[PDB]
Structure formats: C-alpha cells, structure tokens
Symmetry: D2
C-alpha cells in the first residue's frame, strides 16, 4: 500500500505523477501536466489512508498541485480525490477540482476525472 | 497572503481548519470536522499560489485530509479546492470531493461546498 | 410539494428560475441567467421525486438548460441537481455542472452551487 | 446531430439510455440503471444544443432522471452534463451529480462520470 502507491504514474492525457507515500499517511512528489497552462514539474502534497482494506482493493487518497513553479504561474490549483486499487493492473482512479484565482467567481472551478496507471 | 491564510478558519458546519501557509506555497495544519465519521484533529497538507493577484481578491489553494487519526479511520479522504479572498470579511470559498475507499466504485465520491470565515 | 416547487425562484447571482412541477414528476419552465454568455429566457426541463418525504424536508430534483435561444448560443448546457426544502424559508439547494461543447475536452466542465429562494 | 443523438446508448456499468432528440432541443426517453437502488425504466428529460459545431465534434447536452417509477422510489435524482461526439465511435461523455433527498445535507450529493457508446 505504501509500497503500492510510491512511484511514477501516468494518466490518460500523458501527465506524469511522481509520488512517495510516507508511513505517516503523507504523499509528496511532483506533477507534470501534459496539458493546460503548465510546464515542467510542480510540487504536490497530499494524504492517503495508511491503514486501508488490506486486499489493496481501494485505498482513499488525495493531493493538491498549485500551478506555480519557476517557469509559470497559472494562478490556479487542482485537487485530486480518489482511490488506489492494487493488483496486476494497478490504478489510481480520481476525480479532480481545478480552481482559478483572480487573473466571475461562479465560473472559477473546473471538474474532471483522471485515471492513473503504472505504464503510459 | 501568506499572512492572510495562516490561522484558524471555521466553516458553516462548525468545522475548524487550522493552517500555516509557507513562503514556498505549502499549507500544513489540522482539520476537525463537526460532522461525519470523524473525531478530534486530522493532519492536512496542501498548496497555495504564493504569488497571486496582490489585491487579495482571489488566491487559488487546495488541501487534503485523510480521515485516519489515532481515534478513527473512516477509510476516506477529502480534498478542498478554492480560493482565499482577503479584506474585512476574509473568506476561503471551496468546493470539495470526498472519496471513500473499500469498507460500488461508481458511488464512492461525494461533492460539496464549504465557506470558511475567520469568525464562527 | 408539487405546490411547493411550482413558481418563480431566484438564486444568489440574481438569476430567475420559473418552473411548473407536474403530477407525473415533470419539471418544465424557463431560466434567465444574470451572468455568463446568456440573455433573456431559455427552456428548461427536468424531473423531481413526486412521492418524497411528506414533511417537505428534502425532495430530490434536477433540471437542464441548453444555452441556445433565439438571441444567443453559448454551445453549452447546465444541469442542476439538488433538493427542495419547504417551510417558511423554502429553498432549492443545488449543485451544478456546466459542459461546453466545441466552440481541450479535459477543461470542458465547470462545477458550482446555486441556492434558490422564493424572494430575491 | 438530432440524428446522431437519437437512439439507444450504453455506459460502462451496463446501463441503457434510450433517447429521442427533438428539433426544438428536447431530449426525452427512458433510463435503466444496471446499478444502485433502481429497477426497470425511469423517465428522463433533458436538453441539447440543436445548432452546435457542424463537425459533430462536441454537442453540449444534459438530462435528468428522478429515481421514482412504479417499482421503486430511491428518493434521489441524477443529472448528467456532457457532450455528444459523433463519428465512427460515437460517444456521449458525461459527468453526473446524484442528489439524495431525505430518507446530513452536506453528504447528500454523489459525483461521477459515465461514457456512453452505441454498442455495449
Ligand atoms: Ir471511475
Ligand atoms: Ir499573474
Ligand atoms: Ir475522460
Ligand atoms: Ir473512466
Ligand atoms: Ir461559491
Ligand atoms: Ir476498517
Ligand atoms: Ir450549503
Ligand atoms: Ir455559498
Ligand atoms: Ir449546501
Ligand atoms: Ir457557434
Ligand atoms: Ir457561492
Ligand atoms: Ir451554500
Ligand atoms: Ir472525460
Ligand atoms: Ir420513502
Ligand atoms: Ir470510471
Ligand atoms: Ir473516462
């Protein structure tokens, strides 16, 4: 589970999620989006259930990226909420919320879904 | 902005969000939910736009809580995505996704909205 | 309940929702948005639980507006999902999804929340 | 487009969506869910952009089902918001909100995503 989550993951858009799962429930790493107003890697942090169902069938987790790095600032942040499912074709299945700051409040949040796998 | 976000916040359900905004864009703290399968404080981590619009009118941010502490484990995680709005009646306006692990995938994610203020 | 829902409602943005609840569970009417790429009235249709909890404490309902009328076409559609709560300060509390067609799939859907009341 | 949408569609859960797209932008039909507190067919209604991009590359649409029929009442309603994409492998790509009435307001709305195809 700690072991299952730690590593490099890829979504359906070609984005790359590099994460380390801590014994304490921490997620730390970097995110590189293949799309949008983004380039290179962005810091992420999050949390996961460090004592889930032992069958690896669904470990709840989430993380945040703020879209500011040394190259760009998109004045926005995405949070992903989902679960890690272990096994031969391990997956992290997520839904996400992307909020844009000021750069029309009602129109400030996009929603979508990303599925991450261990192979691109 | 760093200064604006750091502190104790309260939502409409009576929950308490204690956060420190780092110069580096980190959010760290604790969350206590007034509702659901939760008691006492849970670790949170997140990110915020550390170079936003300078008028404090909308700073993008997000954070995650995994609902495991030393009292309980609800095998779930919530992510909040939103923006900090400064001024006399400072607010963090969020939308959230709560994913439940295994404890029916299609029915695993709740969505809602929380508005945080500096006074309860 | 049929009686409770039928009528004119107003949200926090100043939009106007005019609806008739049918005995058969139909919702029919018009929507005028105070915001976005919209003017005048748009057709809506939806459904509601025509045999809910009798205390009026929470009747599930939803409706759709496609943002095409004789004035404009924003090539988009919004769906509202929520519940009608009766009583002295009757409310329809909703969450909404706004999808934009082609005019970047991942960025095609906004999410938000609207609270409707019988007085503006 | 009218022609493209009208017909029987199937999602990844094995649910069946039967719809007629009207010249006027109406969607009418029946929905049968393969999952949840549901059996047999439920009435749906919705709307679609009846003058979209002519390449069939993304027509915005939405619909509602209230989960009451002559067999069951789940005191809930789902709205789907998405777009129809034409071509050899035609699709309706949606995100959905399912609200439950009274049967804990904060926990009343599920969110997910369904992809409909013309073959099961
Ligand atoms: Ir999914
Ligand atoms: Ir800027
Ligand atoms: Ir998708
Ligand atoms: Ir999917
Ligand atoms: Ir809001
Ligand atoms: Ir458990
Ligand atoms: Ir609310
Ligand atoms: Ir609000
Ligand atoms: Ir609400
Ligand atoms: Ir157009
Ligand atoms: Ir709001
Ligand atoms: Ir609210
Ligand atoms: Ir999608
Ligand atoms: Ir009932
Ligand atoms: Ir899925
Ligand atoms: Ir998908």
């Amino acid at each position: 589970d700690q072991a299952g989550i730690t590593g490099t993951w890829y979504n359906q858009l070609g984005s790359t999620f590099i994460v380390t799962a801590g014994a304490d429930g921490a997620l730390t790493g970097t995110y590189e989006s293949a799309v949008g107003n983004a380039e290179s890697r962005y810091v992420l942090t999050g949390r996961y259930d460090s004592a889930p169902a032992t069958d690896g069938s669904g470990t709840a987790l989430g993380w945040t990226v703020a879209w500011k790095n040394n190259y760009r600032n998109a004045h926005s942040a995405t949070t992903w909420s989902g679960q890690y499912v272990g096994g031969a074709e391990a997956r992290i299945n997520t839904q996400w919320l992307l909020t844009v700051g000021t750069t029309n409040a009602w129109a400030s949040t996009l929603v979508g879904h990303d599925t991450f796998t261990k192979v691109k």
